């Protein structure tokens, strides 16, 4: 026989969304009488986008019994109509075994972990609760973006733990760590063919992102990851934006700008595009063929801005193939329209590699 749904603990209900933030609630609640139950940051809340605060329960000995009573009787709390399910990416906290810290970003710590069910190693991005509300409201962007994608050179989303605090975004673990560190530790033994393959991987990922109308905005060696087989994957989509018509205009307040990787029109006018990511790609090429040198090492960020405005660019690294440097130079055209596309860049890199 079957256990009735209403006899199940709240924790198990498809329409219990736990620690789902407000922004997400409003998105999920679409039609009249759509509803879900969630927890207040011991109060539970029946959201229908009206928010009704819930040993009995009312507005029954359990909350599922209350919802069923309401739904089945159409009694006014507003009348409930349709319970709204968690989407397929939601993962319970108990499905994840958290491990040690592996990095930090502007939202807080990143940890390794394992899925309890099959031991899959994962990366777990966390959000510090003490951050400003406008920032915390952006935390789930990386999940919203990555839910849509599947590519060998893009970090895979595994799940989202929004049933309780602290909220996590769970992704594949790319076990060789960041590409900048990789270049600085392994660089002396790396062949040029390998470097070409790895920036080829990056170009493949970026071509994919352009095809999805995604603008990354923080492309750099530090934000790419390397597998144990030297495959490169693009990560840290915290700054990324999706724009159907190709341009993201910076909104409003202060921004964190990685100045030495950022195109002039992005840095000074907040015009971001696949073209501005192409500039960043050129910097990534320079990082790679210099085996992890810091760009413009003798200039502060303000100085680099002025240097670049005057037509200054990074020098050719020693032993960088000439076709690779020419491509860099094209990536750093002042006018965004004069830069090559990621499709063009990937083709060129594949051509250069095949001739090596």
């Amino acid at each position: 026989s079957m256990i009735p749904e209403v006899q199940k603990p709240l924790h198990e209900q498809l329409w219990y969304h736990g620690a789902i933030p407000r922004a997400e609630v409003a998105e999920l609640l679409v039609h009249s009488g759509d509803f879900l139950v969630r927890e207040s940051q011991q109060e539970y809340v029946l959201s229908v986008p009206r928010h009704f605060i819930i040993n009995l329960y009312r507005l029954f000995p359990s909350i599922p019994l209350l919802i069923d009573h309401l739904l089945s009787t159409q009694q006014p709390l507003v009348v409930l109509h349709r319970a709204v399910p968690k989407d397929k990416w939601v993962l319970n906290h108990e499905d994840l075994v958290l491990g040690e810290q592996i990095g930090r970003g502007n939202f807080g710590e990143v940890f390794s972990g394992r899925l309890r069910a099959d031991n899959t190693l994962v990366a777990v991005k966390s959000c510090r609760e003490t951050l400003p509300p406008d920032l915390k409201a952006k935390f789930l962007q990386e999940a919203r973006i990555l839910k849509q994608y599947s590519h060998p050179n893009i970090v895979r989303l595994i799940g989202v733990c929004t049933q309780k605090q602290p909220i996590y975004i769970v992704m594949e673990l790319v076990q060789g760590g960041d590409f900048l560190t990789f270049l600085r530790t392994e660089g002396a033994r790396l062949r040029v063919k390998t470097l070409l393959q790895m920036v080829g991987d990056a170009a493949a990922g970026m071509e994919y992102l352009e095809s999805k109308c995604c603008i990354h905005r923080d492309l750099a060696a530090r934000n790419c990851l390397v597998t144990e087989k030297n495959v490169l994957k693009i990560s840290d989509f915290g700054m990324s934006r999706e724009e159907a018509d190709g341009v993201y205009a910076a909104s409003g307040g202060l921004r964190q700008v990685p100045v030495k990787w950022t195109a002039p029109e992005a840095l000074n006018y907040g015009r971001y595009s696949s073209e501005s990511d192409v500039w960043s790609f050129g910097i990534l090429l320079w990082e790679t063929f210099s085996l992890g040198a810091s760009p413009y090492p003798n200039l502060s960020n303000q100085q680099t801005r002025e240097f670049v405005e005057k037509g200054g660019r990074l020098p050719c690294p020693e032993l960088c193939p000439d076709a690779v440097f020419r491509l860099m130079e094209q990536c750093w055209a002042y006018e965004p329209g004069q830069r090559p596309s990621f499709s063009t860049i990937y083709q060129e890199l594949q051509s250069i590699r095949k001739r090596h």
Partner: peptide, 5 residues
């Protein structure tokens, strides 16, 4: 690397 601007 990052500047708030």
């Amino acid at each position: 690397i990052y500047e708030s601007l």
